[model samples]
Target chain A: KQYIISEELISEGKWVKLEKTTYMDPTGKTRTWESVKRTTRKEQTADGVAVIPVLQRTLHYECIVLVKQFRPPMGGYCIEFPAGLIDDGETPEAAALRELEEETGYKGDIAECSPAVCMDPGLSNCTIHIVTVTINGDDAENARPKPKPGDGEFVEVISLPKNDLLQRLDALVAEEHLTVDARVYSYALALKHA
Target chain B: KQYIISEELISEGKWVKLEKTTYMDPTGKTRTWESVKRTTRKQTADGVAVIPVLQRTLHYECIVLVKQFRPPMGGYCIEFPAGLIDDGETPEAAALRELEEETGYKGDIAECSPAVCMDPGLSNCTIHIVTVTINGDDAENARPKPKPGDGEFVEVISLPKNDLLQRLDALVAEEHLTVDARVYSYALALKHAN
Candidate 1:
């Protein structure tokens, strides 16, 4: 999908960089939208590999698994779908399954996966692939979905009942418990029913 | 919600800054994430997004989508036409103008929202969502003639609103079409829209 490599960052970082972009706007005027660019070291582009893991449930429609962690940019905690960067030569499907299991202790088969989409166009060119995984009743590998101890990521995995995914998120926002990711928030809205 | 800055390191042409942040997780784990910040952004940031739905026949169809190659992402991304609202510019106006400028199509806001943040965990940047309808049903208007915005080489895609899920899958299967996260998740939600 990627063949052209014309972008050169003015500065570099381990995960991000400051890029000077000179482009033409609709007005035919020379314009530059100088912004910070997030980087995928392996791909060396702003396109990132991430996932939205949904666990299938019998009691309700399904349980939407997510993570709550402190994001440094806003200096607050955010509740977002389990996501991670794809490793070199890793398929998005493989990365989704691995991230879901590693982040929330649940594993599921890929029900649907969206093409890699841009997360924020106004800011950085960072993009993510949203994968919907359906977790069955039990993991054949384990007795139940349980968080592993050695992952080293300090996160709280929350499984919201699919029926009330939006309501729970609303409650979280109302109580100032955490901010929500746009994709996760929109997903709740999309999957929400009256 | 704004954070009180204790320290700041900034450079010209660098819109992003690395800051030491202090925060409280839900479990009182007083933790910190090594994060980046957009220092020059406004506290009241509001961009506009449009989901244009046109009624062609029996179904309310939406086609005009932006496919632009992003430097950061290093790929072409599929997304609803979007733009940032300027001072004295309403979200509705911004959405309409953006659509016209990018695709030469005019639309009326069917539904619009106040600026909201989906990724408050990562950046403070906020955007408004607006559902719109293209004004015409003819070949000239319905057929998206994208006059690629400056610095942009975009292609407009026309797809059935009802078969979005399958269409997206086929696009991914055919390859080269990367879907944006918000667009993909919202497209999923639209499948169940009343």
Candidate 2:
């Protein structure tokens, strides 16, 4: 492991923090890199990072579940897959299950998963494991998957027809001022064409 | 409009920074959020994300991609030609320059979108995703292929747009390739489009 010369806390918050770390690169050259890390949720570890669950189902209708909320940073409504951070000692699969339900009122099982990939490596250590889940149904255990009014944050659950994904995605963005993340947007592209 | 309560810098880097932002919610609730900022460039105009789609008569045929070792993911990832828009550089120029530098293919920008956030929950960072089309003759004439410039270890590859799912599955099944979410998602779009 590259030795850490020192770590200085630059900013502090409930959800995330900034740290300046001076460490030796693979070439033994010392370098200072500023990294942003998540905090405030009561967990800390490499594995306890972020989880992005691509919720989909073919029970009632083949669809993808997405959430729309106002992201302060974006200063506008942002649309993305149901996602959340892993709690301390929580396995990624468990986190995915809980987050899918909490974020979109959906009950699902993780059908497949990708490794915990870092979204942007050069600037931050923030990473997320991508998983695809098959929603079971909107039954007693998990009411019909829809964002309830007055959820923790103003979140709207939107489901897009799997077959007509491209049309729905474009319509949502153009008509609702909803911007998409690359993950969900590209997934639809691969789906429609591939 | 939500009013800004205060801003505190947590850490600073040559090109990025983290800060704690306090703001009022739409309902007059106060909240603190952690946000990232570009220290050296404008957020709206700093980077280019290119979807270099190869074309045949009346159809999108293939896509040019790059494979490289991304430290954060701790493995090689398959992604599109993308990079930071340099100082005072336009997104159009960055998209063309990055595509050629990384893949040695010349193409025309068919469509462009303003900067869109990749992970609004974590940072405000956004990238302009541009669609570029390459002529069959130009791709064939490129001299023996262009090695990725600036000592970056990126291998250039191409895939038929129609057969993306199978190819992606094969690479992923062999445990050698992890598809970048953006690239994979966009592939779905091309598949569904004419």
Candidate 3:
């Protein structure tokens, strides 16, 4: 059925609509969902019909702090890798570095960052861009965590081999470890081989 | 207080022992929660356990059908390969064959099958120990399908190596996929690389 349009609401935490009623039925089969605005798209540019756009491909580096913690939903410790959400006007590289320090207490200077991104473009209109920053063993060993950090959750960090899926699982399960995408790792392995 | 043996109905769909109540609330005030019959687990067999002992893993192959028509929940039409219960025989071998038939209908002979696992350890305790079988252009191009075969709906079977993460989200969003433990390609790369 086509969506019936009504008054539109744009105010935050406010009901900006009229003649609207909501039904609360978690198990009810029948339901109603309303969109107060009609879907419309028209590319009307003030400039006279722009044609060409500039585009370029480039390479970069990023860091991920594999974090560990208890997951209440799964009722087990999980392996979750730390990642920086790219905010407005921020480069993915900067976010990666900042996130590493904020989450894992690592402050190493990124030497050479790879241009590749292990991104999940299908989930959203965004990118899970990752940059690889080399770290010295000494730096890793000497690093101490700050439980209270700027705009980040302090977490225990573990360095995992990029290619050892079984071992990674063993470590996480053994230590009751949790990583950001530990769940995804099992899935990733299956897809790779299956 | 300690529990004394008792019996009674607990809820609409449950039954238990009637018991006493607890004391105290967190607000430094007196409160009480009803004490009830405790549920305990035990072995049905006195001298022997009735658990299905599994030295073998049930393997499955998931052929990700990357169709684009699933817009509601970001659907992808991914389906399973010819996954099978072990025939009291070689499971890895069975998985390899299934992977080929499902994916591009092609793969190297005994070269692709990767790993195995369970569906869920909690409620749905189905074990699906699987492996991978990588197919080539020759095999995939010449392989037969179950029915309505690959087309625009079943676009390219396998994508580039880098799309592993994106494939996970896309398959979940587009395919309504919810296998907690899934096998993927990038993980295979990680394994082989290690």
Candidate 4:
């Protein structure tokens, strides 16, 4: 692995630092970037280093979508599927299940979703692991927490018919619900899983 | 449709006027996007509308690449199958034919593919369409062009299985040759084809 030193920013803004970092350019020139990473997040450095978007796996069959009510930085009430960040200590598969349960009280299996990543190379380095679940009307009544909560919005969890579930995906794409990581990779899943 | 005006800077320090447009939003909030598209080429406008990236459909696939020394863009050069745009198209059908020619150039019939997109959601909005040409080579000794001593430079082609994927993330993430729509869609296609 190409190693890099992790240096803390001097100030809230002074994050960019340059050293005698040798660049292995074919032209024998030192390749430099003004901002290789972010101050708040442990962003990746451009030493040809990439956080390849997360891998995703989903069943070709139908699945449950926990219509989560998440509050994005932009601030808005939105409905979407259950998903979360690839935490430092977790695998994407583990995160998916954790997020699903945290948001919808969903406890079940994710069948068929194999590992996959987003096709759009830019935007994000995230992946969404998906699986299929069966929920009944009785299960649905017991699964949802409440109607619209704010630390995030608490909305009733709705189990949409697979086709109806896809219709809602547009919202995820429109809002921050489905990330570029998932949006790009979910196309074929639209048909294959539907 | 929501309409807006925007401006953008392009090559040569010139600006252009554009009228950006989008499909209607469910909530009716104005679709406001000023971030111009970045693709293989970056476009700009003078206080025009946001130009959501253009999508492409496959033309025909000979399983051969348009091997050109793109000097404006520097590269040692790489091989990619050649295809054109469709007036109205589907990625699956496009991949089917392209795979037939490039990989199945003999008396082989084409089959279904994984349905790859050139770009998932970035500037590209079409499917790239790909399939493996199994069994035998089709265009073994055909000239890339029609005549003798005419552009013999890019005539050699092959459907090497090992060469299908490479480190596109580095280049694509840097906005060198990919956008959200096209590149990402390709991922879904790859999943299906693979």
Best by TM-score: 2
Instruction: Write one digit per residue (lDDT tens) for candidate 1, span A35-73.
Output: 556555465232444555556545646567788765666
Task: Encode model 3's per-residue lDDT on A1-194: one tens digit a residue.
Answer: 11123323321111111112122222332223221111111231110110000011123121223555332222233444445455455555666567666666665444322222212111111113434444443444325545335421324566554435455555555563222242234433443343
| lDDT of every model, 2 decimals | 0.64, 0.67, 0.32, 0.30
TM-score of 4: 0.37
Q: Give the Cα-based TM-score of candidate 3 against the true structure.
A: 0.41
Worst 10 residues of 1 chain A by lDDT: A1-10
DockQ of each: 0.36, 0.34, 0.07, 0.08
Q: Candidate 2's residue-wise lDDT over A36-148, tens digit each?
A: 66664344323332233333334555667777777776656777887777777787778777777777777777676555455665455566666667775544555555543
lDDT of 1 by residue, B91-180 (tens): 888888888777778777776544456454345666676677786676657555656554666667767766776787788678665677
Candidate 3 global CA lDDT score: 0.32
For model 3, the stretches where C-alpha displacement exceeds 4 angstroms are A1-65, A71-76, A108-127, A139-154, A161-165, A174-194, B1-131, B134-141, B146-152, B157-194
Q: Listing every candidate in turn, what is its Cα RMSD in Å to the true structure after a full C-alpha superposition?
A: 4.8, 4.8, 15.0, 12.2
Docking class of 4: incorrect
Off by over 4 Å in 2: A1-33, A39-61, A136-152, A176-178, B1-5, B43-45, B54-62, B69-77, B87-89, B136-141, B144-153, B159-179, B184-194
Q: Considering every candidate listed, which one attains the maximal lDDT? A: 2
Model 4 chain A — which ten-residue stretch has the worst lDDT?
A44-53
- Deviation (Å) of A35 in candidate 3: 15
CA error at residue B147 for candidate 2, angstroms:
7.2
TM-score of chain B of 3: 0.37
